[PDB]
């Protein structure tokens, strides 16, 4: 029940792409992954400049800070969460129906821990430099990540549908 897609972008395109996703997807809540703590804080600052509420969570924080933020997220205080690879036992927030890999992971085990489990969309931002990791992860998981279509069926991720 998670539909996986990729957009092909360059680093300089990623934010405009992300703004278009925010604009056109029927997001209830979303989780956005980056490949480091520093880039997480950078993207949270940027999402806030584009107009969207977000929280953020990363490896360089006290555990209890992270727990409270995530409890505040679960209760709907913000609509988007920006984070690093914090999930071990899966994502059990029901309202999250769109997960975004702002940075594509390197390892298949990283990718699995991001994408289990939003009905939901997993949208991958793929650069030329991610090409080997895309192939490796597709092969290891036994999965296909399809190109993002111009119209995403609402029945794939909006629960009223």
């Amino acid at each position: 029940g998670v539909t996986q897609y990729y957009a092909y972008v360059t680093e300089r395109q990623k934010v405009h792409c992300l703004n278009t996703l925010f604009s056109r997807l029927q997001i209830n809540q979303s989780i956005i992954f980056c490949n480091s703590s520093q880039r997480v804080e950078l993207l949270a600052k940027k999402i806030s400049q584009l107009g969207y509420s977000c929280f953020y969570i990363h490896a360089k924080m006290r555990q209890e800070h992270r727990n409270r933020v995530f409890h505040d997220f679960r209760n709907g205080l913000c609509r988007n969460l920006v984070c690093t690879d914090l999930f071990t036992r899966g994502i059990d927030i029901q309202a999250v129906n769109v997960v975004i890999n702002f940075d594509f992971p390197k390892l298949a085990e990283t990718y699995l821990h991001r994408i289990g489990r939003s009905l939901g969309l997993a949208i991958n931002l793929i650069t030329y430099d991610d090409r080997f990791n895309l192939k490796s992860i597709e092969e290891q998981l036994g999965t296909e990540i399809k190109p993002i279509p111009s119209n995403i069926d609402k029945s794939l991720y909006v629960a009223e549908y």
Binding site: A7, V9, Q13, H16, C17, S23, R131, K135, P147
Partner: peptide, 30 residues
Amino acid sequence: EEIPDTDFDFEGNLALFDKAAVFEEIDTYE
């Protein structure tokens, strides 16, 4: 930082990546 006034062109940009052809090149040479 670069944000045009129009929606991001997903479709044009996906034409810049011939996924199945790249993968085959990867398997052949890389």
